[PDB]
């Protein structure tokens, strides 16, 4: 932490650039980062660990692919996620540009299976297209119930950002069955306030609403 934390100083920055010219020293460097990942979560410390992992030895770069997928990419700081993604796409490019004998004997097949199962099992592969596309090409180098199913698809979820359109999808439910399709197992309680507001907008203008009664 003190090595990365002082990286703007010329002796320790020249030291870090001297680490990148040795294979086993950079491998021990990335093992040292993997050992102490939990205390590197503040924005300045992660920004310095991304400035120190930008250019390393071109073999060991395959290993930093793993550290760009498993640990650092799940941070909620979006520029840190973006910069991990830029560096990881750069590593997969510089891995594809090298020899296949040096890359296939480095990056395992079952470990790449673990990486892509972590990408597909989480939502991170839907976020960033280039990383999953480059990993896949590295693999390749070697109407009523339908509307009910639609509102099941876009209301029964963890959380959304579209709350107005969600309440408008709840609006033209056939209104004889609202509590069957609102009082359910996992219904969003953040969609439940725009249901109240739009039901009040329907009551205060004209004929009464079933949205406001149900909500």
């Amino acid at each position: 932490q003190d090595l990365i934390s002082l990286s703007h100083e010329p002796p320790v920055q020249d030291f870090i650039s001297a680490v990148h010219r040795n294979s086993a020293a950079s491998g021990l460097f990335i093992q040292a980062i993997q050992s102490r990942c939990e205390n590197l979560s503040t924005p300045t410390m992660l920004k310095k660990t991304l400035q120190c992992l930008e250019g390393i030895h071109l073999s060991q770069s395959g290993a930093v692919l793993t550290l760009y997928v498993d640990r650092l990419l799940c941070t909620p700081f979006r520029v840190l996620a973006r910069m991990v993604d830029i560096l990881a796409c750069r590593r997969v490019e510089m891995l594809l540009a090298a020899n296949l004998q040096s890359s296939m004997a480095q990056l395992p097949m079952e470990e790449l299976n673990r990486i892509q199962e972590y990408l597909q099992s989480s939502g991170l592969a839907q976020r960033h297209q280039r990383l999953y596309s480059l990993l896949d090409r590295f693999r390749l180098s070697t109407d009523k119930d339908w509307y009910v199913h639609l509102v099941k698809s876009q209301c029964w979820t963890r959380s959304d950002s579209a709350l107005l359109e969600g309440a408008e999808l709840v609006n033209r439910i056939p209104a004889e069955d609202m509590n069957a399709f609102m009082m359910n197992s996992e219904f969003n309680l953040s969609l439940l306030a725009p249901c109240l507001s739009l039901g009040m907008s329907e009551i205060s203008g004209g004929q009464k609403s079933a949205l406001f009664e149900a909500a």
């Binding site: 639609l150 359109e165 969600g166 408008e168 033209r172």
Partner: protein, 506 residues
């Protein structure tokens, strides 16, 4: 009073549209003193019905709030109880017992008037403030008698007593019948106090003018001492024409409020050149920059101008001048001032070769869709479907909608797609639904030329879900506009579904 221009088959739609406009004006401009929470639908006016009754909703009192008041501000401001309410609440026309407390106060202040100058000033100010609660004509008689006795006894070189005394004497005279023995000293008092140097003496005298001019059918000799006030209003609108930030704020505001009242309810007593000069000076007042004329002065003068427009009194040339000034202030850049001027152009296009004029002003509203902050565009997208549906026949509005939805100089076609949906389902009369199908075919022949691909497929998907069958395809349209960009295999599936559903719709 509640207007004559409403309660018609035409006026109700105008009340709806201006209810939307003024509703999000009071979301943007207003001062939440009534309101504690953060919600959008919080507009609330404490005007009761009138032996009191229930509370009147805000959508029913559209332009009843006086121009003396800041938008949604709640404080005592010398115009709380109108003498309409004095004459018809308590039936006098020429659960706490408040009446006994008011009688005991009149006894106390009549004995203290008849003591240092400070107590006399605060007692007359007290008497004017407590004067909203008097429920008997004898109380106003005793009020006016004690105040004329104070005017006779106390000397004249005390202007603080004057600025707390003049509205009290004028209101005590205004509740009573405005007879000659009452009208001569009150008008002499007002003509004397309008020449003073103390500025809230002018403010209190002008509120007293508003109480005198309010409801009493007034004497023919006493209405000839009106044009002193009219000369005062001409001079102090010509003086405060250019600069408003320098002089004052509440003086100009109450002064324009009584000027608009004199235009509205007493037309014939003053010449038409006076109302023309007020419309000219207020057109100058609206045309100031964002630092010259403040927001409260702007909105109050503007609300008074459309108050005069909804009255059936003004001539057509001054109405056309207000149309031109309203357009040239629609073209201002601040969002709430543009919204208020949009309310002006709504009320201008409602109290009345004209088809080309409608083309021009609807193009003005679309240019205010293009440039403009998104709350303003929310308001215009809420207005514009029933607007175009009920003005002029659908071929020209359909050419405008097709020609200005697909522009690359459109910042976002989101709200415009909601407009397209509401316009299509307000154009689903059957013989017009055939015309709808013809416009969809012509627009598709325009759609065959390419936009960027994800944007093009999304706009086509919104257009097919927009103009479609009744039961369940239209309800998808919020979800269709939930994702604006971001092409997907789900997007291709739903686009194919609605396109094949329209292939059998013909």
């Amino acid at each position: 009073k509640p207007l004559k221009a409403l309660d018609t088959r035409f006026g109700r739609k105008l009340s709806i549209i201006r209810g939307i406009v003024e509703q999000e004006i009071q979301a943007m401009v207003s001062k939440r003193e009534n309101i504690a929470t953060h919600h959008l639908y919080q507009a609330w006016d404490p005007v009761p019905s009138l032996t009191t009754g229930a509370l009147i909703s805000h959508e029913k009192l559209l332009l009843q709030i006086n121009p003396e008041r800041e938008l949604g501000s709640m404080s005592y401001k010398l115009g709380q109880v109108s003498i309409h309410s004095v004459w018809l609440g308590n039936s006098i026309t020429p659960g706490v017992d408040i009446h006994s407390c008011s009688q005991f106060l009149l006894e106390l202040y009549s004995r203290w008037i008849l003591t240092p100058a400070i107590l006399i000033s605060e007692v007359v100010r007290s008497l004017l403030v407590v004067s909203d609660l008097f429920t008997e004509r004898n109380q106003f008689e005793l009020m006016y008698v004690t105040l004329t006795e104070l005017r006779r006894v106390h000397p004249s070189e005390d202007e603080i007593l004057a600025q707390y005394l003049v509205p009290a004497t004028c209101k005590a005279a205004a509740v009573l019948g405005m007879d000659k023995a009452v009208a001569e000293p009150v008008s002499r008092l007002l003509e004397s106090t309008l020449r003073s140097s103390h500025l809230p003496s002018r403010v209190g005298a002008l509120h007293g003018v508003l109480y005198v001019l309010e409801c009493d059918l007034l004497d023919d000799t006493a209405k000839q001492l009106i044009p002193v006030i009219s000369d005062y209003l001409l001079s102090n609108l010509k003086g405060i024409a250019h600069c408003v930030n320098i002089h004052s704020q509440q003086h100009v505001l109450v002064m324009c409020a009584t000027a608009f009242y004199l235009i509205e309810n007493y037309p014939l007593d003053v010449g038409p050149e006076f109302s023309a000069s007020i419309i000219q000076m207020c057109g100058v007042m609206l045309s100031g920059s964002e630092e010259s004329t403040p927001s409260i002065i702007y909105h109050c003068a503007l609300r008074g101008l459309e108050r005069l427009l909804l009255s059936e009194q003004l001539s057509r040339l001054d109405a056309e001048s207000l149309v031109k000034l309203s357009v040239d202030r629609v073209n201002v850049h601040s969002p709430h001032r543009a919204m208020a001027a949009l309310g002006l152009m709504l009320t201008c296009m409602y109290t009345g070769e004209s088809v080309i004029v409608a083309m021009e002003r609807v193009s003005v509203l679309f240019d205010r869709i293009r440039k403009g902050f998104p709350c303003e565009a929310r308001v215009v997208a809420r207005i514009l479907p029933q607007f175009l549906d009920d003005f002029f026949p659908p071929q020209d509005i359909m050419n405008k909608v097709i020609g200005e939805f697909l522009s690359n100089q459109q910042p976002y076609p989101q709200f415009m797609a909601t407009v397209v949906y509401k316009v299509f389902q307000t154009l689903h009369s059957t013989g017009q639904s055939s015309m709808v199908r013809d416009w969809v075919m012509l627009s598709l022949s325009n759609f065959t030329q390419r936009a960027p691909v994800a944007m093009a497929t999304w706009s086509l998907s919104c257009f097919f879900v927009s103009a479609s069958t009744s039961p369940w395809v239209a309800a998808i349209l919020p979800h269709v506009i939930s994702r604006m960009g971001k092409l997907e295999q789900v997007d291709v599936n739903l686009f194919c579904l609605v396109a094949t559903d329209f292939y059998r719709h013909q």
